[PDB]
Amino acid sequence: SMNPPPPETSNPNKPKRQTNQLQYLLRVVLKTLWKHQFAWPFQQPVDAVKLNLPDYYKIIKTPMDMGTIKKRLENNYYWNAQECIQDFNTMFTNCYIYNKPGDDIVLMAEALEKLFLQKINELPT
Amino acid sequence: HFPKGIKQIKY
């Protein structure tokens, strides 16, 4: 099909390390974005079959979505906040490089990204 | 482009 398997969500052999920043990313940042009116296209991997995007997974080399980020946080996949933040940035970047500027999905992504950046400004030190 | 389409009907 046009769709790959979803990204891995468990980090093999990685010891558990909890931090305030990771708790904030899961319970504040991701929660706020997930509940936003524009979150739904980003809550699971892009469905290239349903949307008829034959080249999506040719163009986008590192797929990412909020569902994957959520599971990664829950599984303590990330060693630090910066790794989690990079996955969010990849998600937004993928949208901006694939979709025509001005498309609904791009406007939605931009709104979510503005909120993301506001919440990351209050990341614990 | 392969647009995704609209995510809300504009009326």
Author numbering:
A (entry chain A): 42 to 166
B (entry chain B): 1027 to 1037
How is this structure described in the published paper?
Bromo and extra-terminal (BET) proteins provide a recruitment platform initiated by the recognition of acetylated lysines (Kac) by their tandem bromodomains (BRD, Dhalluin et al., 1999, Jacobson et al., 2000, Owen et al., 2000). BETs, like all of the 42 human BRD-containing proteins, contain additional interaction domains that recruit other proteins to the acetylated protein target, forming complex assemblies and contributing to processes such as chromatin remodeling and transcription.
Based on our earlier work defining the flexible G at the X1 position as a binding preference for histone H4 (Filippakopoulos et al., 2012), we fixed this residue to screen a subset (91) of all 2521 unique K-GX-K motifs found in the human proteome, focusing on nuclear proteins with Kac sites annotated in the PhosphoSitePlus database. Additional peptides carrying a Kac-GX-Kac motif, including those from GATA1, ATRX, POLR2A, and TOP2A, adopted the same histone H4-like structural association with BRD4/BD1. Our structural analysis identified multiple cases of non-histone proteins binding to BRD4 BRDs through histone-like motifs in the same structural template we initially described for H4. Our data therefore suggest that Kac-XX-Kac motifs beyond those found in histones can be recognized by BET BRDs.
